[PDB]
Each structure stands twice: as structure tokens, then as C-alpha cells.
Design an enzyme around this catalytic site. Sequence first.
Site, PDB file in Angstrom:
ATOM      1  N   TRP A 155       0.937  -1.443  -0.108  1.00  0.00           N
ATOM      2  CA  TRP A 155      -0.022   0.080   0.105  1.00  0.00           C
ATOM      3  C   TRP A 155       0.934   1.119   0.179  1.00  0.00           C
ATOM      4  CZ3 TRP A 155      -0.032  -4.259   3.076  1.00  0.00           C
ATOM      5  CH2 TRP A 155      -1.047  -5.291   2.690  1.00  0.00           C
ATOM      6  N   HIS A 166      -7.036   0.869   2.368  1.00  0.00           N
ATOM      7  CA  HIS A 166      -7.935   0.035   1.965  1.00  0.00           C
ATOM      8  C   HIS A 166      -9.270   0.202   2.949  1.00  0.00           C
ATOM      9  CE1 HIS A 166      -5.154  -2.816   4.643  1.00  0.00           C
ATOM     10  NE2 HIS A 166      -5.498  -1.715   5.226  1.00  0.00           N
ATOM     11  N   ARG A 189      -4.329   5.710  -2.520  1.00  0.00           N
ATOM     12  CA  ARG A 189      -3.089   5.061  -2.549  1.00  0.00           C
ATOM     13  C   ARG A 189      -2.304   6.321  -3.342  1.00  0.00           C
ATOM     14  NH1 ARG A 189      -3.422  -0.165  -3.109  1.00  0.00           N
ATOM     15  NH2 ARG A 189      -4.981  -1.181  -1.940  1.00  0.00           N
ATOM     16  N   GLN A 218     -13.539   0.361  -2.587  1.00  0.00           N
ATOM     17  CA  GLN A 218     -13.369  -0.960  -2.088  1.00  0.00           C
ATOM     18  C   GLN A 218     -14.763  -1.556  -1.400  1.00  0.00           C
ATOM     19  OE1 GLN A 218      -8.609  -2.388  -1.489  1.00  0.00           O
ATOM     20  NE2 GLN A 218     -10.227  -2.006   0.044  1.00  0.00           N
ATOM     21  N   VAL A 246      -4.338 -11.886   7.390  1.00  0.00           N
ATOM     22  CA  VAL A 246      -4.945 -13.139   7.383  1.00  0.00           C
ATOM     23  C   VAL A 246      -3.920 -14.538   7.107  1.00  0.00           C
ATOM     24  CG1 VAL A 246      -7.258 -12.651   6.337  1.00  0.00           C
ATOM     25  CG2 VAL A 246      -5.569 -12.966   4.606  1.00  0.00           C
ATOM     26  N   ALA A 266     -12.580 -13.140   5.730  1.00  0.00           N
ATOM     27  CA  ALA A 266     -12.766 -11.798   5.414  1.00  0.00           C
ATOM     28  C   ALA A 266     -12.072 -11.494   3.859  1.00  0.00           C
ATOM     29  CB  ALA A 266     -12.255 -10.669   6.167  1.00  0.00           C
TER      30      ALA A 266
HETATM   31  N1  LIG Z   1      -6.918  -5.293   2.270  1.00  0.00           N
HETATM   32  C1  LIG Z   1      -6.493  -5.908   1.140  1.00  0.00           C
HETATM   33  C2  LIG Z   1      -7.560  -6.933   0.518  1.00  0.00           C
HETATM   34  C3  LIG Z   1      -8.169  -7.882   1.508  1.00  0.00           C
HETATM   35  C4  LIG Z   1      -7.437  -9.259   1.541  1.00  0.00           C
HETATM   36  C5  LIG Z   1      -7.972 -10.114   2.619  1.00  0.00           C
HETATM   37  C6  LIG Z   1      -8.765  -9.772   3.329  1.00  0.00           C
HETATM   38  C7  LIG Z   1      -9.332  -8.485   3.422  1.00  0.00           C
HETATM   39  O1  LIG Z   1     -10.543  -8.148   4.446  1.00  0.00           O
HETATM   40  C8  LIG Z   1      -9.231  -7.496   2.436  1.00  0.00           C
HETATM   41  C9  LIG Z   1      -6.091  -4.941   0.092  1.00  0.00           C
HETATM   42  O2  LIG Z   1      -6.562  -3.757  -0.102  1.00  0.00           O
HETATM   43  O3  LIG Z   1      -5.128  -5.200  -0.873  1.00  0.00           O
END
Ligand SMILES: N[C@@H](Cc1cccc(O)c1)C(=O)O
Lengths: 233, 266, 157, 785
Positions: A32, A61, A87, A101, A144, A197
Site C-alpha cells: 500500500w 483499504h 493510494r 473497495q 489473514v 474476510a
Molecule cells: N486489504 C486488502 C484486500 C483484503 C485481503 C484479505 C482480506 C481483506 O479483508 C481484504 C487490499 O486492499 O489489498
Amino acid sequence: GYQAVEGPEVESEFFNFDALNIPEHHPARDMWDTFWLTGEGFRLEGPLGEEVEGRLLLRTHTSPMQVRYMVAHTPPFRIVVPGRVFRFEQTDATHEAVFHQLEGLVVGEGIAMAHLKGAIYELAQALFGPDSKVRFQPVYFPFVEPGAQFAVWWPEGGKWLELGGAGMVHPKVFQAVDAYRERLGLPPAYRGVTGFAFGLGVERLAMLRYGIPDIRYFFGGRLKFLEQFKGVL
Amino acid sequence: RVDVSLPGASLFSGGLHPITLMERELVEIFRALGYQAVEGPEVESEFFNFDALNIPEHHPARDMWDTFWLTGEGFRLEGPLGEEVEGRLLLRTHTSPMQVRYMVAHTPPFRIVVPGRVFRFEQTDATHEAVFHQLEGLVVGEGIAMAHLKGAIYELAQALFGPDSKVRFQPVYFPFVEPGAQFAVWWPEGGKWLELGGAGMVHPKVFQAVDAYRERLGLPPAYRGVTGFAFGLGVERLAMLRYGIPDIRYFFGGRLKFLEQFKGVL
Amino acid sequence: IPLALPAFFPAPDNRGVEAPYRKEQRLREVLSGLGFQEVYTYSFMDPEDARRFRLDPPRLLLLNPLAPEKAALRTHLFPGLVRVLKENLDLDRPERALLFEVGRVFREREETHLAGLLFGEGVGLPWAKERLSGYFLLKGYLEALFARLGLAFRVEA
Amino acid sequence: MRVPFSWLKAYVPELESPEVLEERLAGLGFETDRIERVFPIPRGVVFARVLEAHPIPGTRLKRLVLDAGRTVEVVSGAENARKGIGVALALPGTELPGLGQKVGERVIQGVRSFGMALSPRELGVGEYGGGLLEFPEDALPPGTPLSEAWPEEVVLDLEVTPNRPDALGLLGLARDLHALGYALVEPEAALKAEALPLPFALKVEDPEGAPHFTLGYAFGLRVAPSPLWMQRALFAAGMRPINNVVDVTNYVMLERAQPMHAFDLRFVGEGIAVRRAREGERLKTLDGVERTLHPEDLVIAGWRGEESFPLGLAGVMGGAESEVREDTEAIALEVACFDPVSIRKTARRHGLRTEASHRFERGVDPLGQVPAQRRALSLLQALAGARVAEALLEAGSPKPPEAIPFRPEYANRLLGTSYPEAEQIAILKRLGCRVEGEGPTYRVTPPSHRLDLRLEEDLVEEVARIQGYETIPLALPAFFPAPDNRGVEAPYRKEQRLREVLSGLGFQEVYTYSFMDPEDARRFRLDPPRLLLLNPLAPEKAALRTHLFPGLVRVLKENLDLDRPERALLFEVGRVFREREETHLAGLLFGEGVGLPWAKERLSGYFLLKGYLEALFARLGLAFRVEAQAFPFLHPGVSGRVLVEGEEVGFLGALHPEIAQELELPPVHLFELRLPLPDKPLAFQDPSRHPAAFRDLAVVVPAPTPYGEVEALVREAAGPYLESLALFDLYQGPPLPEGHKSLAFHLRFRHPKRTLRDEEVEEAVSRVAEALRARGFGLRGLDTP
Ligand SMILES: N[C@@H](Cc1cccc(O)c1)C(=O)O
Ligand SMILES: N[C@@H](Cc1cccc(O)c1)C(=O)O
Ligand SMILES: N[C@@H](Cc1cccc(O)c1)C(=O)O
């Protein structure tokens, strides 16, 4: 079953990065390209509406909201949060500095990855027809594990669309939530639950779904453009 | 002086009928639990409205609904797959029929809610109507159970009367369901149980009727090994104790000093 | 009997099954927004109206109407509208109105109908005289509703 | 990370093909951004021996005398053009991709060149075109076609992620595959090492910026060109070969995510010292760039006597002087694990990004240094003759990784799968992990190279990716959401309905950038932005909007210039910043107006938009009045505030002339306010049956008194049985007492339970005509049927 909640565009680096297991001077931070803000006389409230400190920025995000929500509420639940994200990048035909998003997060006892795979499937059908299919490839995201990127098959266009990313919530993101929780007098809530998520980019879809060639158009505020959608539904 | 508190170009301010409101509210509630919404035709053929729904003739059950019988030459009434169908025409006494049309046109599992206008030959007073809408829901699929009926009516209580609202289930008779029952919701504010509607698990014979009418059309059986529950409830009642409208007759009176009072609502 | 909730992937043919019901609502709403008041008229007709409002008689009737006036099934949505206008003008004296009803009309086939009547002084300045109304007012309103729906629209005599 | 297929196939002999690989990687977690076939080498391109390079009198060109099966001559002007090496001779006729011309036998400076030897660029094997290729003089028999030793290659441009630095080594990839079930072939360190001391020493003055540091001693070096296979593998992976030793360090780097530099001893002195750089210390990095170190830049330094000098920037780039070359005969080999953040900051600091920095910023195998030595030393022994010191200089002793608790039952319960235990354990073991215990919960300790493996989760994703993300069934959850989540969406909905009602009524939605131009706070007259950017996209986008309305006015202009809209009724809804972040709604009017396309009489200006808004509200069921109040950005004569439900929430009015004049825009009306608009509950009012009592009169007010005050007045006292108050006519002039005005007011009174007497109305009207005069207002007429 997903309910929709919005988040604030001006975030505090705590939520946007630290709560989401993204430390500093970390290679992940590079995924990011942040926009840093500077201003005296700005109150930025958190979950329970209290005052919060941190280095201000425009969210890269929508994930942060995934943390604010969990401290403000208790499992199980399903939510989707849409929103504007920023961004620092160069705006061309298929790229933008300002673009929306959509995040979804489902947490609760027994939750599983199968359920993530199921919901992305249901999104494929609902969006591209019974002949549309979803694909899941392992990818890296600090918030995650397991995690991955997912693509949908668009039969008409006959090509896979890398849609977004997702995975099962990171143990440390729950710890962060429950921690910031006690610090507010609230009892722990996510000790024995699981959750998944995902997050995906709008403009992409909207583009290959309304056949809009140049992403720059969305913000150009041109009438000969916005009018062409008056009908749509 | 160039005033600004002055009235502007009197443009027309739209609105919506108490029922469209209260109907949508109900739809969205159920849409959220996965129920899709399909409409049915107000002029039905006694087959769907009564025989498919295990309600025979000269049967005591037939008396629960006071039918409106139609008579007309030159009227095409199409069924499920859009074919021509024969039967003694009438204005539907409920929405259930649609529960049959849908099942022959589609295959389990699925969740649906069907709202619609229904008619009954009765005397229109303060809390009674000859023309009044209903809402049916039917969820069919392998493993379905009554627990799931009890669950969905609960979710409707919460969504409608708050976390302090509760549902009650009492056994009652309906030819299209067994077990069956009437259900009441507790309205904490008003502090009294509201007999909301009826429901139960679909009757074995209603599936037989569906699969039968199915083969008769070349379609293969679909509901041999599934289960399902369905419920149906009256709108006007809710809409009344939810918008505080004293006289049911109002809904159709087409009075403006009345319909306008809801322009805001959502 | 415990509470529960089902979980299952709906069967394919059930997918999209609601386009129609939605499609109608958006229309009722767009209409409710633009500036039209929704109405609910009884499905019943008075056989004597086919005569009054000049219409081919009702193809369906009742072997047991509530009253002679409610002895047939409406063929047009528009008469119920004209009648409310009158019924209103007598209870309250609306100086104008822009209604619209959407309902099932019977004749040959049962079909869903949309309609609404204009009327009243018009649209202008409450303290000024110059005003807009009549045919073209409602004709414009409709062109809007369509431009909004993104549908072509012409009106030949 | 260029992934040369033939190379990776050396560790994974059983690979099916490029494509199957791209497929296999993608599943492992690595997505290839492209595949390329790379070494098309014609037949004319034979391998030759340079028998003798002769200079050409008067020129800077040399006449090479080649042994290419037969003895041929070739004119060349390349610095490396010398005797003793092997060249890539492209015989006359050969068509080369790197020069888009046909190679002939032309005459250059009195000598006829029978073709020409080539550079990595002319052959096409690489971008470098500053000198011939240099191969072992005996690589191939003179003449044999190069193709026969340099087959084309397929290279996958892989994507390695922060979590898999081990994947920065072809052998790291090669292990992931081995877990998929493939066979692994790890190379062996064929070392003939001899016991003897190391002619130098190691002193690590900064154990923080270099937690583990090793050196190895290789001497007897016979620096020459790398064997054709290595030059190929190196070239394919993106690097240019230099010579034995140098190449052998790049190769091993790529082979195992372990950067390593070979320092010529001639410049080491008494020892190597790893230490922060002294302020201003200078260093001439390999790129031939003269730099000036910084106190934080960890360095590799040699010391002679009492002098300490920079040999190279640690884990980023070596010094141009210590660099191994032809005459080197011994070296000190760096093979260590540096500190991520240091290397990170240093690299950033000097604008350097290298294979070495890159891997150190991501991480390296904490216990890989020793084994990396053997690999490298063994190679040097084979490719360079290297005699090697059976010992090493090792500073630092990292602790092996810790055991992670693993319950297979959780693997599944989390994935929603149901792989059997034994199947899980073995997956981990294939990946290197060690598994202890007999269940339920196991003790798993990752291999040192897996920095990504800390938690149980990381461990479950290990089963996941090797079984197949695709082998994870689909499902859907069922649960009663928790109470506090109930209603959680009222707000988001509430907004949409509003956007829609607005989209219906007749307003076009817009999307403006959140960014503001600081200079606008001035133009549009507004208190400056409370938030700014430490890194805007441009000066114009340097602040965060405080008002939604300027973006609107600007689009209007931007439109009028591209297309000439004769009118427009926009509206935007977005987050505005100032003190607090708040959601704002606003839209501007403009254009001819609303009327008949073929007629003149029209409606527009203030009141048009003022009416539109009254609608939008009547529709939302919210009270709404607009009292005048000046505003910097608005017009003075045409300006006021908004009042929804008796509380101010924004403004409505015409733009300010000058702002128009300064923007070159016609009169543009508009408004702005703050959501969530007031929420009013329904108080159902069972309408009376009985008829209403019509009433009429026009209040005589002085030209100034705003309609609002008059109205509120009349109403305020217009009894509790009033139904409607409405202004139908506003007149002022003769014969009225000049400088005044009369307001035609239509009234109606209605009792709910019964009808009303004339006495009840005649007496209820005198109440409002009395307080009206008691205020200073008259009365044109009264009681008119
Ligand atoms: N925040 C990530 C996308 C993403 C991936 C996995 C779980 C999430 O809740 C969101 C991005 O913006 O690249
Ligand atoms: N049709 C019944 C209500 C009902 C009861 C049970 C199941 C349903 O689907 C419907 C009535 O109108 O009285
Ligand atoms: N830049 C060196 C590689 C390297 C690796 C580690 C530490 C260093 O100082 C140097 C080279 O050119 O090979």
C-alpha cells in the site's frame, strides 16, 4: 445475511496498519503506497466514539473498519463495508489514486474457509451466471492466514478476473481487537471464534460490467458520461 | 428586497402507499435471510387455490375462506410453465396457490416470499376487509425442519419489534400443512401478543400434487425426498399496529389527507 | 422445538427469480420520488362505468359481488384514479394532484398496469401567476420518468 | 524473479513443462506474470578459440585470429578482445536478432573480417553490448555450433511475496514443489579442504546489524570465464557473467537466497571488520559510483595496521576495488545474515536496490551461512582450482527455530476440510518441518529457512496449499447474529434512500475527488483546510476538501467547456474534512431553466432549486424553511441558511457574482448541508370527516419583512384549528402605502369531531388580525368566497 456499515476515510495508522498485523519498516507496508496527513485541530473518533491518537492518513483499504466493528460489536455477525480508499499512485487508464473497495467479514464460532469459498461462489453466480466459476490461489496478507487472491470466470468475456483477496482472519488481528477492547473496559469477545474476510475493488467490476474503458472517467465528473447510466436499474 | 424565505416553484412531492411500505419492510427483512420474492396472479383457478392445496370440495376447510367466484368467456389464465389451464375461476382467498405454481416451475432447494392482493367475501368494517394483502413464504429442501420455521419467524420478530420481542407457536389446522400452527409475536411496546399468521411444514399431499401436475407436463418429479415449511401472514394488520392506522378501510379509501402522511416513512 | 436456520446453495433455476418484482418496485420508487402520489384502488369495477368512461365491457364478473357497483373486475386502472380525484375534491379541496396507481387489470389476460392522472392549478410560483400545467406538464413529467429509466419515449396522436 | 526452467529442473528433475510449472507454482502461492523462450541461436554462430589478438595500426581495433575448426580472422574493437579466450563467432551469412542485419564477410581497415565475434547483446542472450562474450578456451571443439551447448530456454517471471523469502532461491521453490510430491535433487559440496590457518581475521563491531557473519578462505584461484552452463543460467536469470569466482557467488545467491561477496585478499589487510561507517567515510561501489557513507550504513571494512577502510557496503553492494578479477589468487568470502531494517534504510538511503539488498530486506536463512559456504567453496574448487581452508571465521550463533503446537483437528475445523492426520503430518515433513508427539496436539518445529512459519495457522495454510486450495469444499454458515449487530445498517440504508429519492426527483449524481486545492479556500472564500498532505499528487491536490460545493461549481465549468450544457441540476454526496470528518450533501442548479422547449416563459434561478428542495423534503417528510443569512461564498442579495425540522444544517443560495466573474461563469445557484438529516417519527393524524372552513386575506407588510416572519406570525396565532395557510398572491405598489407589500393568504380551519361555527372562525381570525396589527401589519381584504 451481510449487513452494510461504513467507515471514515481519514484513519489513524493504528487501525489502518498496526491492528491489521502490518508493522513498520515492514515489506508488507509496501503493498500500500500511503497518503500521510498533517493537521492541527482534527478530532478522529474510534469505535465506541472516543478520541484516538495515531499518525493520520487516508485509508489505503477498507480493512481497518474490520477492526473498528469488532470492538464495537460481538460475534457472530456478517458485514460488508464499502468505501473510498486512497493510494499514492499515478492515475492512468486502468489505475487510480482514489478508488472504492468492498470488504466483507464474517466471524463466529465454527466459521471456516469453506464458508469463504462458498460466499465468493455465491457472488460469482449472482454476478456472472450459473456458468460462472470461482478460483482460489494462495497469496500473502498480514491480516489473514490462510490467505489468498480469488478470481471469477466471466463466461461471456471468457477470461478469469482477479477479483480480490481474502482469507481467514489472523490470530493477531483478534488479539489486537480484544486488547484494544480491555483497554476500553469491554470484555474479550473473540477468544474462541474464527472468521474469514475478503475485500475487492469496485471500479474494476463496474468497468467490465458497464463496459467503461477508462477508470479516470469515474471522477472526471463529465455529464456526457454519468448520464449514460441514468437507466441502469 | 430579494427575500429567500419565500415559497418555491411548487413541484410535486411523491409518496408511497402504507402497504408498499409495510410490504417492502417485510420483503427486505426476508430477503436478508435468503428469501427471493415472486408475485402471483390475483385471478386463480380453483385447482391451485384449493385442490392442489389439499382443500377438497364440500369440505369444512373450504369454509375458512369465503370465496369470490368469477364468470367470464374469453379469459386466458396461464399456469406455471405458461401453458393454458382449466378450472373454475375465482379471486384468490390467499396467496398459497403461488406456493404450488412456483414448485412446478422450479426445483429445490429455495426460499421464496410472495406478497399479493387476496380477496374474501366478507363485510368491510374497521378491522376487516374484503380486499387485503398477504405474504407467503415457503422454504423447501433436503433436511428442512420445523426448527427452521420457528427460527425464521423469530428472525422476523427481532427485525420487527426489537431484541425484546419474542415469538409463540400454537398448533392449528391447515389442510396444506402438518404439523401446522398459528404464530404470535410479542410487541413489548404495546405489551401484547399479536396473532400474526399461520404456518407449518408442507403437507405430503401438496408435494404429490406438485409432482403429479409435474409429470402431466413432461417434467420429472422433484419433491420426492425433500421437506419444507411455509407460512403466510396478513399485511394490513401489521402496517396498522406499526403506523398506528385505526381503520383498515383507509388503505383503499384513496384519501390524500391519508396517503400523504406516509410520504416520509423511510 | 429448538430454533434454527437453514444453509444451502439454492438450485440454479431459482437464480434471478426476483428480477421482475424488483423491477417493479424501482419503478414505483422512481415514480414516488419524481413527484407522484401512490394510490390503492379496489380491483372491483362497476359495470355501469364501462358505459360512463366509455370502455368495452368487463370480461369477468362476479357470481356473488359485494354490491352491484362492485360486480365486475376492472379493465382499466385509470377510472379508479379519476374517481378518487372526485372523491377528494368533495372531502378536501385539493387545488391540484399528481397521482399514480399500479395494479393488476383484467381482460383477455390478467396484466399489470401503471397509470396516474394530473389535474390542478399546476406548477409555478405560489405568489406569482405564470404557471405550468395541463397536458405538457404531465407529458414532461413522463419524459423525465423515462429519461431516468433510460427508455426512449415519443407520443403520437 | 526470473525462474529459468532448465535450471530449476536440476533440483526438480521430474518437472513436466514450463506450463505445468506455472500451474504448479500458482497453486503453491507463486503467480507467474509471464513465460519466455529466450536463446534463439542460429547455426552460423559457432564457438571459436581466440588464437591471437593483433592491434590494427592507426585504429583502436584488433584483428583477432580465430580457430573455428579452420583458421579465420575477424576485426574487433572490444576491450576484452584478447588471446586465450573463447568467443561466439557468427560466421558470414548468419542472421542475428541483436543487429537486425545479415552478418557478412566485410572489409574493415585493410583486414577482411570473416564474420564477427559477439557481445551478449548481439547474440541476444543479454542486454550488455560492451564486449565479446568470454568462454573457456576449451568449452567446445573449435567450430561446433554454439546452439549445441546453448539451447533456447524458457523463463517464468515469478512473483515471490514478502512472506516467502526462501522462495528467492531457486532451491526454495524447488522444495515447495518437492512437497507437492516431486523429487528433490540438492547439490553436494565436493570439498577437498586442508587444515591450515586463515591469513586474516574477523571483527564484528556491530553484532546488531550483523547477527551472524562468516568468512571462508579460498586460495590458489585461477580466475577465468565460467563454464557455458553457468553463463547461460546466469544470463537467463537476469545477471551478466563476469568470471569464475564472481559468477559462482551470484549463482549460489540465486540458488539459495543467500547473497555472498568474494573479497580479494590483496585489499583485506589484517582482517575484515563489520562496523558502522564513520561519518563522511568514502567508498567507490562496484557500480563505479563514488559514494559518501553515513554513520548508520553498516559496512564491510578491512584494516591495515591502525587504518580502517570500507571494503563494501554490507549486504547491498561491494567495493569496486576489492572486486575479484583476473589476477586475484585468494579471497575472503562473505556469507552472512544482515539486519533487515538496516539494509532496508541503507539501500533506500543511497538509492540502491540489488539482488543482495532485496533478499536481506526480506530475510535470509539464519543458519544458512555455513552451508552456503560449502556450496560456494565447492564450486570455487571445481571451477577455479581453489584450495580451501578446512575452517571458517564465524561470528554469531543464532538459535534454532521454536516448536509450534499443531492440532490436525484444527487444521480441518478451520479449513472446513477433513484431510486425515497422517496425510497432514507427512505434508509438513516433506516441507522440512520436524513433527513430534503422537497426537492430538503435536510439536512442529519449522526448518530454519521458513521465516513465515510461526503460528499454528501458518502451519494449517501449509496443509491447505499442498493439498490444494481447490480441495476445500464449499459451504455457507448459519447462525443467529448477535443482538448488537441488529439494525447496524440503518445509517447506510438511510443514505441510499436519500441518494435515490434525489436521483429520482431529478438530480444528477456526481463524484468529485476528496482532494482540494489550498488556493481555492481563497477563491471560493473559505476558512483554510484543517488537513493537508505530506505528499500530495500535486499542489492543486495538496489539501482535503472542507466543502462539497466547490467541486460542483468546478465541474459545471469543466462541462461548459467540453460540451455546452444549457442547464444542469447536479448533486454530490461525500465525506468533507474539518474538525471532524462529516458526510455532506450538496448540488448546484444553473441553466436556462424549466419550461416549454418552444415557449419562452420559464422557471429557474433561486426559487426553482428552492422548490426542488421543498419537494425532496416533503417527500422525506421533513419540515423545511430557509431564513436569510449572509455567507462569504454565496451572493449577498440571494443567500440564506437551511432549516430542516427547525434546526440549521447548511445553506442555500446563488453563488457570489465576483466568484462567478473570477471563474468566468454565469449565475450558478446551489446548496450544501450535513447528513444524517433530522429523523422525524410518524405521528399519525386520523383526518377529520367534517368539512373545512375556507378563509382569505392578504397581510400588509413593509417591503423588508421576510415572508417567513409574516407567515410564522399569522400561523403562530392562527388558532389551534387551522388546517392550511398558503400565499397565493404577493403584490406591492399603487395604491398600497408605498414601500410595503400585501401577502395573499389562503386559510382553512377544521375541527376533527364536529363542524365549526362562523363565530368560532370569525372570532378565531380576529385573533390573528389583531396580533398582526399589534406587530405593525395591516389588512387588504378579509372574507372572500
Ligand atoms: N486489504 C486488502 C484486500 C483484503 C485481503 C484479505 C482480506 C481483506 O479483508 C481484504 C487490499 O486492499 O489489498
Ligand atoms: N393460507 C393461510 C395462511 C397459511 C398458513 C400456513 C401456511 C401458509 O403458507 C399459509 C391463510 O390464508 O389463512
Ligand atoms: N554487492 C555484492 C553482493 C554482496 C552481498 C552481501 C554483502 C555485500 O557486501 C555484497 C556483489 O557485487 O556481489
